[PDB]
Short mmCIF file of N, CA and C and ligand atoms in Angstrom, two decimals:
data_model
loop_
_atom_site.label_atom_id
_atom_site.label_comp_id
_atom_site.label_asym_id
_atom_site.label_seq_id
_atom_site.Cartn_x
_atom_site.Cartn_y
_atom_site.Cartn_z
N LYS A 1 86.09 100.48 95.99
CA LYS A 1 85.26 100.49 96.83
C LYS A 1 85.45 101.50 98.06
N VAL A 2 84.29 102.10 98.46
CA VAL A 2 84.27 102.81 99.55
C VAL A 2 84.05 101.97 100.91
N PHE A 3 84.93 101.73 101.74
CA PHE A 3 84.47 100.88 102.92
C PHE A 3 83.65 101.93 103.91
N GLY A 4 83.02 101.19 104.81
CA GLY A 4 82.44 101.64 106.13
C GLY A 4 83.65 101.59 107.10
N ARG A 5 83.47 102.30 108.00
CA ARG A 5 84.26 102.40 109.34
C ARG A 5 84.77 101.20 109.82
N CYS A 6 83.50 100.42 110.45
CA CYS A 6 83.67 99.19 110.81
C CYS A 6 84.11 97.98 110.24
N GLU A 7 83.63 98.09 108.92
CA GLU A 7 83.72 97.23 107.94
C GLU A 7 85.44 97.13 107.46
N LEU A 8 86.00 98.11 107.37
CA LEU A 8 87.48 98.15 107.21
C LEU A 8 88.28 97.94 108.33
N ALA A 9 87.87 98.28 109.59
CA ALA A 9 88.49 97.72 110.77
C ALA A 9 88.42 96.17 110.92
N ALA A 10 87.38 95.52 110.53
CA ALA A 10 87.09 94.21 110.61
C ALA A 10 87.96 93.41 109.47
N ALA A 11 88.26 94.10 108.41
CA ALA A 11 89.01 93.57 107.29
C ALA A 11 90.64 93.84 107.66
N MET A 12 90.99 94.78 108.33
CA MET A 12 92.41 95.13 108.78
C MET A 12 92.67 94.14 109.70
N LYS A 13 91.89 93.93 110.74
CA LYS A 13 92.02 93.07 111.53
C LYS A 13 92.33 91.49 111.35
N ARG A 14 91.39 90.97 110.38
CA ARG A 14 91.62 89.49 109.62
C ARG A 14 92.92 89.70 108.94
N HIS A 15 93.25 90.93 108.47
CA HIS A 15 94.86 90.63 107.86
C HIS A 15 95.88 91.10 108.69
N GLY A 16 95.57 90.94 110.08
CA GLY A 16 96.69 90.97 110.96
C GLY A 16 97.42 92.47 111.43
N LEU A 17 96.66 93.38 111.05
CA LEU A 17 97.20 94.91 111.25
C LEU A 17 96.84 95.21 112.91
N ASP A 18 95.97 94.62 113.66
CA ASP A 18 95.65 95.14 114.85
C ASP A 18 97.00 94.87 115.73
N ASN A 19 97.41 95.93 116.53
CA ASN A 19 98.83 95.99 117.21
C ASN A 19 100.26 95.64 116.43
N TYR A 20 99.91 95.31 114.98
CA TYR A 20 101.12 95.08 114.27
C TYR A 20 102.29 96.22 114.39
N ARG A 21 103.48 95.53 114.96
CA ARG A 21 104.52 96.74 115.31
C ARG A 21 104.09 97.60 116.60
N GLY A 22 103.14 97.30 117.08
CA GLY A 22 102.68 98.03 118.26
C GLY A 22 101.71 98.95 117.89
N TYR A 23 101.04 98.98 116.73
CA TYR A 23 100.07 100.08 116.31
C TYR A 23 98.78 99.52 116.48
N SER A 24 98.02 99.89 117.21
CA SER A 24 96.43 99.44 117.60
C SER A 24 95.64 99.69 116.48
N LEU A 25 94.47 99.00 116.06
CA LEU A 25 93.77 99.13 115.03
C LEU A 25 93.18 100.48 114.67
N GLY A 26 92.97 101.17 115.77
CA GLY A 26 92.35 102.50 115.61
C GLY A 26 93.21 103.44 114.65
N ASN A 27 94.64 103.19 114.93
CA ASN A 27 95.68 104.10 114.11
C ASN A 27 95.73 103.66 112.79
N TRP A 28 95.21 102.47 112.34
CA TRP A 28 95.15 102.23 111.03
C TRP A 28 93.92 102.68 110.32
N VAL A 29 92.85 102.54 111.06
CA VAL A 29 91.60 103.19 110.56
C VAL A 29 91.56 104.64 110.37
N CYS A 30 92.32 105.19 111.30
CA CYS A 30 92.54 106.58 111.18
C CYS A 30 93.00 107.05 110.18
N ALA A 31 94.39 106.42 109.96
CA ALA A 31 95.24 106.78 108.80
C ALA A 31 94.49 106.68 107.59
N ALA A 32 93.64 105.54 107.34
CA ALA A 32 92.78 105.21 106.00
C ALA A 32 91.74 106.44 106.10
N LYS A 33 91.21 106.88 107.03
CA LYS A 33 90.14 107.97 106.76
C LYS A 33 90.64 109.12 106.34
N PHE A 34 91.72 109.46 106.94
CA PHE A 34 92.17 110.88 106.17
C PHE A 34 93.33 110.79 105.22
N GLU A 35 93.67 109.66 104.66
CA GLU A 35 94.53 109.53 103.50
C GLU A 35 93.56 109.05 102.30
N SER A 36 92.54 108.50 102.47
CA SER A 36 91.85 108.17 101.33
C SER A 36 90.31 108.34 101.43
N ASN A 37 89.94 108.65 102.62
CA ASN A 37 88.46 108.59 102.96
C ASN A 37 87.84 107.45 102.78
N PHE A 38 88.65 106.34 103.07
CA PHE A 38 88.20 104.86 102.95
C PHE A 38 87.99 104.25 101.52
N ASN A 39 88.41 105.08 100.51
CA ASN A 39 88.15 104.86 99.09
C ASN A 39 89.43 104.05 98.73
N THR A 40 89.11 102.93 98.04
CA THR A 40 90.39 102.04 97.45
C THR A 40 90.91 102.60 96.33
N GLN A 41 89.96 103.34 95.59
CA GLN A 41 90.51 103.97 94.30
C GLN A 41 91.14 105.28 94.54
N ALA A 42 91.49 105.82 95.61
CA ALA A 42 91.84 107.25 95.69
C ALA A 42 93.33 107.01 95.15
N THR A 43 93.49 108.25 94.38
CA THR A 43 95.03 108.51 93.72
C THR A 43 95.34 109.96 94.00
N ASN A 44 96.55 110.17 94.06
CA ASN A 44 97.02 111.60 94.28
C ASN A 44 98.55 111.87 93.77
N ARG A 45 98.53 112.81 92.89
CA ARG A 45 100.01 113.13 92.40
C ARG A 45 100.70 113.89 93.19
N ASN A 46 102.21 113.71 93.51
CA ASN A 46 102.84 114.53 94.26
C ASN A 46 103.63 115.31 93.42
N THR A 47 104.35 116.43 94.04
CA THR A 47 104.92 117.43 93.65
C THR A 47 106.49 116.93 92.79
N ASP A 48 106.99 115.79 93.11
CA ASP A 48 108.06 115.24 92.54
C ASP A 48 107.63 114.20 91.33
N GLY A 49 106.42 114.22 91.07
CA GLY A 49 105.97 113.06 90.08
C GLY A 49 105.40 112.01 90.44
N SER A 50 105.89 111.45 91.54
CA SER A 50 105.39 110.21 92.18
C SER A 50 103.77 110.34 92.34
N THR A 51 103.24 109.31 92.56
CA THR A 51 101.74 109.32 92.96
C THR A 51 101.34 108.19 93.94
N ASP A 52 100.39 108.64 94.90
CA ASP A 52 100.01 107.84 95.78
C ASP A 52 98.70 106.96 95.46
N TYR A 53 98.76 105.86 95.99
CA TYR A 53 97.72 104.76 95.69
C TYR A 53 97.03 104.37 96.62
N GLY A 54 95.61 104.31 96.58
CA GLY A 54 94.83 103.33 97.22
C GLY A 54 94.46 103.75 98.83
N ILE A 55 93.99 102.90 99.43
CA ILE A 55 93.18 103.19 100.81
C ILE A 55 94.28 103.88 101.73
N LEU A 56 95.56 103.49 101.68
CA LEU A 56 96.68 103.99 102.45
C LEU A 56 97.57 104.86 101.70
N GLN A 57 97.22 105.08 100.42
CA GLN A 57 98.19 106.25 99.71
C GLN A 57 99.51 105.78 99.73
N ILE A 58 99.91 104.80 99.35
CA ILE A 58 101.21 104.13 99.16
C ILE A 58 101.91 104.64 97.99
N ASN A 59 103.19 105.32 98.08
CA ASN A 59 103.94 106.12 97.10
C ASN A 59 104.62 105.27 95.97
N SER A 60 104.42 105.68 94.92
CA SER A 60 105.30 105.16 93.95
C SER A 60 106.69 105.38 93.85
N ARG A 61 107.23 106.25 94.59
CA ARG A 61 108.63 106.80 94.36
C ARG A 61 109.45 105.61 95.23
N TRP A 62 108.74 104.91 96.19
CA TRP A 62 109.57 103.78 96.84
C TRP A 62 108.78 102.42 96.73
N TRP A 63 107.32 102.15 96.75
CA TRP A 63 106.97 101.09 97.11
C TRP A 63 106.26 100.27 95.94
N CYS A 64 105.78 100.92 94.69
CA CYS A 64 105.13 100.26 93.86
C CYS A 64 105.57 100.68 92.54
N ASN A 65 105.22 99.93 91.46
CA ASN A 65 105.61 100.49 90.11
C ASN A 65 104.42 100.95 89.39
N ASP A 66 104.42 102.13 88.86
CA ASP A 66 103.46 102.55 88.14
C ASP A 66 103.86 102.89 86.63
N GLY A 67 104.97 102.85 86.26
CA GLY A 67 105.57 102.89 84.92
C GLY A 67 106.02 104.24 84.53
N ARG A 68 105.79 105.24 85.75
CA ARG A 68 106.04 106.72 85.21
C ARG A 68 106.56 107.53 86.30
N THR A 69 107.53 106.95 87.24
CA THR A 69 108.06 107.58 88.34
C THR A 69 109.61 107.04 88.02
N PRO A 70 110.24 107.93 87.06
CA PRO A 70 111.54 107.50 86.97
C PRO A 70 112.46 107.73 87.91
N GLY A 71 113.45 106.50 87.99
CA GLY A 71 114.41 106.50 89.11
C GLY A 71 113.73 106.18 90.48
N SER A 72 112.72 105.43 90.36
CA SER A 72 111.95 105.12 91.72
C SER A 72 112.05 103.48 91.93
N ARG A 73 111.73 103.11 93.09
CA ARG A 73 111.95 101.77 93.42
C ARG A 73 110.67 101.26 93.60
N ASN A 74 110.54 99.89 93.79
CA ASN A 74 109.26 98.99 93.82
C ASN A 74 109.57 97.89 94.92
N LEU A 75 109.61 98.69 96.34
CA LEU A 75 110.11 97.70 97.29
C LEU A 75 109.08 96.56 97.73
N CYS A 76 107.74 96.86 97.54
CA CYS A 76 106.46 95.97 97.60
C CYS A 76 106.51 94.93 96.54
N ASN A 77 107.26 95.24 95.31
CA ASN A 77 107.20 94.24 94.29
C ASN A 77 105.95 93.91 93.67
N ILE A 78 105.15 95.24 93.46
CA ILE A 78 103.92 95.20 92.78
C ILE A 78 103.51 96.41 91.98
N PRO A 79 102.54 96.16 90.99
CA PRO A 79 101.95 97.20 90.18
C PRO A 79 101.35 98.16 91.21
N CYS A 80 101.40 99.53 91.01
CA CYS A 80 100.51 100.18 91.92
C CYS A 80 99.07 100.16 91.71
N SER A 81 98.56 99.77 90.64
CA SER A 81 97.38 99.63 90.40
C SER A 81 96.73 98.41 91.17
N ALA A 82 97.57 97.25 91.72
CA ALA A 82 97.11 96.33 92.74
C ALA A 82 96.44 97.07 93.98
N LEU A 83 97.18 98.21 94.35
CA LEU A 83 96.78 98.81 95.51
C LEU A 83 95.38 99.55 95.39
N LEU A 84 94.67 99.47 94.16
CA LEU A 84 93.42 100.10 94.22
C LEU A 84 92.20 99.06 94.26
N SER A 85 92.62 97.94 94.50
CA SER A 85 91.45 96.75 94.44
C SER A 85 90.62 96.85 95.48
N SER A 86 89.47 96.42 95.38
CA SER A 86 88.38 96.11 96.46
C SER A 86 88.89 95.11 97.65
N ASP A 87 89.95 94.31 97.22
CA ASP A 87 90.55 93.41 98.23
C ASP A 87 91.81 94.39 98.79
N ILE A 88 91.89 94.46 99.83
CA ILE A 88 92.88 95.43 100.57
C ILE A 88 94.26 94.42 100.86
N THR A 89 94.30 93.35 100.47
CA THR A 89 95.25 92.47 100.91
C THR A 89 96.67 93.13 100.36
N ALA A 90 96.68 93.60 99.17
CA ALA A 90 98.11 93.91 98.60
C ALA A 90 98.38 95.20 99.43
N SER A 91 97.40 96.34 99.51
CA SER A 91 97.77 97.30 100.48
C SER A 91 98.36 96.95 101.73
N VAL A 92 97.76 96.13 102.62
CA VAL A 92 97.92 95.87 103.89
C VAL A 92 99.43 95.01 104.02
N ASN A 93 99.65 94.21 103.05
CA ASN A 93 101.00 93.55 102.85
C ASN A 93 102.22 94.60 102.66
N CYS A 94 101.87 95.50 101.86
CA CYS A 94 102.70 96.67 101.62
C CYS A 94 103.01 97.46 102.78
N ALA A 95 101.94 97.76 103.42
CA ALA A 95 101.77 98.84 104.57
C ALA A 95 102.81 98.03 105.71
N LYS A 96 102.59 96.63 105.80
CA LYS A 96 103.42 96.10 106.98
C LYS A 96 104.88 96.21 106.60
N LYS A 97 105.23 96.19 105.41
CA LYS A 97 106.71 96.56 105.19
C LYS A 97 107.19 98.02 105.28
N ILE A 98 106.08 98.68 105.05
CA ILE A 98 106.68 100.28 105.32
C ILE A 98 106.64 100.46 106.74
N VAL A 99 105.74 100.04 107.36
CA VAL A 99 105.54 100.43 108.95
C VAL A 99 106.70 99.66 109.62
N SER A 100 107.61 98.63 109.08
CA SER A 100 108.57 98.06 109.47
C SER A 100 110.17 98.67 109.31
N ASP A 101 109.90 99.78 108.64
CA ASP A 101 111.20 100.23 107.85
C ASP A 101 112.04 101.16 108.89
N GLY A 102 111.50 101.53 109.98
CA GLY A 102 112.32 102.33 110.97
C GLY A 102 111.56 103.71 111.65
N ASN A 103 110.60 104.12 110.69
CA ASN A 103 109.91 105.47 111.03
C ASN A 103 108.46 105.07 111.55
N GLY A 104 108.06 103.69 111.60
CA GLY A 104 106.74 103.44 112.08
C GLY A 104 105.74 104.07 111.20
N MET A 105 104.60 104.51 111.75
CA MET A 105 103.40 104.92 111.12
C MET A 105 103.68 106.59 110.74
N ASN A 106 104.77 106.96 111.16
CA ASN A 106 105.24 108.64 110.75
C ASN A 106 105.50 108.72 109.25
N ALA A 107 105.72 107.75 108.56
CA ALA A 107 105.73 107.34 106.89
C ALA A 107 104.44 108.08 106.54
N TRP A 108 103.14 108.13 107.36
CA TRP A 108 101.95 108.46 106.70
C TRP A 108 101.62 109.79 107.32
N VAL A 109 101.83 110.88 106.41
CA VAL A 109 101.85 112.33 106.98
C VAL A 109 100.43 112.60 107.58
N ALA A 110 99.31 112.05 106.99
CA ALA A 110 98.24 112.26 107.56
C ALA A 110 97.92 111.60 108.93
N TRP A 111 98.74 110.58 109.18
CA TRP A 111 98.78 109.81 110.55
C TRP A 111 99.39 110.82 111.59
N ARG A 112 100.57 111.35 111.08
CA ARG A 112 101.43 112.04 112.11
C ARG A 112 100.70 113.44 112.50
N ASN A 113 99.94 113.94 111.40
CA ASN A 113 99.41 115.33 111.52
C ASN A 113 97.86 115.15 112.33
N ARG A 114 97.05 114.16 111.97
CA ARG A 114 95.80 113.90 112.61
C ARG A 114 95.26 112.89 113.20
N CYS A 115 96.24 112.04 113.51
CA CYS A 115 95.89 110.68 114.44
C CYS A 115 96.96 110.57 115.52
N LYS A 116 98.09 110.71 115.22
CA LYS A 116 98.99 110.67 116.44
C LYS A 116 98.76 111.63 117.39
N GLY A 117 98.69 111.01 118.73
CA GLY A 117 98.28 111.55 119.98
C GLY A 117 96.91 112.05 120.19
N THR A 118 96.13 111.40 119.47
CA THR A 118 94.67 111.56 119.62
C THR A 118 94.17 110.23 120.12
N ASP A 119 92.84 110.10 120.17
CA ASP A 119 92.25 108.94 121.09
C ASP A 119 91.80 108.28 119.81
N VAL A 120 92.83 107.40 119.42
CA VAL A 120 92.53 106.76 118.02
C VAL A 120 91.47 105.55 118.29
N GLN A 121 91.18 105.09 119.38
CA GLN A 121 90.31 103.93 119.69
C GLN A 121 88.93 104.50 119.58
N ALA A 122 88.84 105.65 119.21
CA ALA A 122 87.25 106.24 118.55
C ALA A 122 87.11 105.58 117.45
N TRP A 123 88.04 105.47 116.75
CA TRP A 123 87.72 104.92 115.29
C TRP A 123 87.02 103.50 115.00
N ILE A 124 87.37 102.78 116.22
CA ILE A 124 86.87 101.51 116.25
C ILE A 124 85.66 101.16 117.12
N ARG A 125 85.55 102.26 118.14
CA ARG A 125 84.48 102.26 118.91
C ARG A 125 83.17 101.82 118.49
N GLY A 126 82.36 100.97 119.09
CA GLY A 126 81.04 100.30 118.52
C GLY A 126 81.21 99.36 117.52
N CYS A 127 82.36 98.88 117.04
CA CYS A 127 82.31 98.10 116.03
C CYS A 127 82.43 96.63 116.48
N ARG A 128 81.64 95.47 115.82
CA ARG A 128 81.61 94.20 116.18
C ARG A 128 83.01 93.68 115.61
N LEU A 129 83.90 93.42 116.56
CA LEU A 129 85.30 92.72 116.15
C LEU A 129 85.54 91.35 116.84
CL1 CL B 1 98.39 116.29 106.94
NA1 NA B 2 85.61 99.11 93.55
NA1 NA B 3 92.82 101.47 118.51
NA1 NA B 4 96.09 114.61 91.98
NA1 NA B 5 108.08 103.11 91.74
NA1 NA B 6 89.46 92.91 101.59
#
């Protein structure tokens, strides 16, 4: 599913991401835009052989099991395919574990390079929330 901007904001808010660990909703929508272009089915292969999955491009090296990343962990205890669902629950629940692990949203390279230190509230401007 390809989300609209305000549709995704509303879904993330309902799942408790607004201000989660101090990150306002616009941060999460900005990260989703540049990680996946709001597409839950996005995948991308990394140089080390791991793969990033879903709307927030969660990596199989640490967070989910895809059966083809040897020596990796599965810290969210989910198959990576669950992160491609039109229902973002699994992605959101795993993202909450990632953002609490000490590095905050810096775990998402696109957030650090394209959202951090910008007016992220623009990403939810105009939305009915
Ligand atoms: Cl980047
Ligand atoms: Na879909
Ligand atoms: Na915001
Ligand atoms: Na790829
Ligand atoms: Na894994
Ligand atoms: Na959803």
